Design a protein around this ligand. Structure first.
Ligand SMILES: Nc1ncnc2c1ncn2[C@@H]1O[C@H](COP(=O)(O)OP(=O)(O)NP(=O)(O)O)[C@@H](O)[C@H]1O
Ligand SMILES: Nc1ncnc2c1ncn2[C@@H]1O[C@H](COP(=O)(O)OP(=O)(O)NP(=O)(O)O)[C@@H](O)[C@H]1O
Ligand SMILES: Nc1ncnc2c1ncn2[C@@H]1O[C@H](COP(=O)(O)OP(=O)(O)NP(=O)(O)O)[C@@H](O)[C@H]1O
Ligand SMILES: [Cl-]
Ligand SMILES: [Mg+2]
Ligand SMILES: [Mg+2]
Length: 144
């Protein structure tokens, strides 16, 4: 396909965004396409031509969440551990939300909502995605 893999581990290379309000009190979440009651964050597979992970992250944040903003931090990598090597290596960025658009590519396939840190953390546990929670915890979100 168009997907890129680690030459070392064969992990699927993915990038996405922890999208925060300017006041850093809320994070943007979306429902999963697979599990429609589970709330996650925007991310997706790096494609063959893309020159950096920021490109992939901002493309997926537009496609999946209708969100435009400014990358303000590199949150490093997290690895997903497919239980009984990693098959996913995620590259996360912190984005400062500049606009949320009513219409975007996946707007009929997903719901979208801003959550406080407490609500977001319970969502990601509920979704069984501790690696996305790892990325959220590295962001400048207010954890009060
Ligand atoms: N914990 C996980 N770690 C890594 N990959 C996962 C995990 N859970 C599911 N996946 C796979 O990652 C891909 C996307 O799953 P998910 O993160 O739920 O996003 P999505 O909103 O469903 N997008 P998509 O299904 O690709 O259109 C699928 O191939 C899943 O099987
Ligand atoms: N492709 C994947 N790579 C890595 N981790 C994954 C992948 N698919 C699922 N996981 C994770 O592995 C765990 C088990 O996932 P899964 O078997 O899909 O459970 P489920 O969708 O919650 N179904 P169930 O618990 O039986 O009702 C979860 O923590 C997932 O996030
Ligand atoms: N990009 C990253 N990749 C991996 N681990 C990280 C990363 N950023 C931070 N950490 C670690 O994760 C934990 C939380 O990180 P951070 O967001 O810097 O806040 P903190 O640890 O509470 N504060 P401080 O120890 O003063 O830097 C710490 O153990 C960090 O060393
Ligand atoms: Cl993904
Ligand atoms: Mg994609
Ligand atoms: Mg995907």
């Amino acid at each position: 396909e168009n997907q890129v893999y680690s030459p070392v581990t064969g992990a699927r290379l993915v990038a996405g965004c922890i999208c925060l309000t300017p006041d850093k009190k809320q994070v943007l979440m979306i429902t999963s396409s697979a599990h429609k009651k589970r709330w996650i964050v925007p991310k997706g597979g790096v494609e063959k031509d893309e020159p950096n992970y920021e490109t992939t992250a901002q493309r997926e944040t537009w496609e999946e969440a209708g969100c435009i903003g400014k990358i303000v931090a590199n949150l490093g990598t997290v690895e997903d551990m497919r239980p009984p090597p990693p098959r996913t290596e995620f590259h996360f960025y912190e984005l400062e939300i500049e606009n949320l658009l009513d219409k975007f590519p996946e707007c009929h396939k997903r719901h979208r909502k801003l959550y406080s840190y407490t609500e977001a953390k319970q969502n990601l546990i509920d979704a069984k995605r501790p690696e996305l929670l790892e990325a959220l915890n590295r962001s400048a979100i207010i954890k009060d």
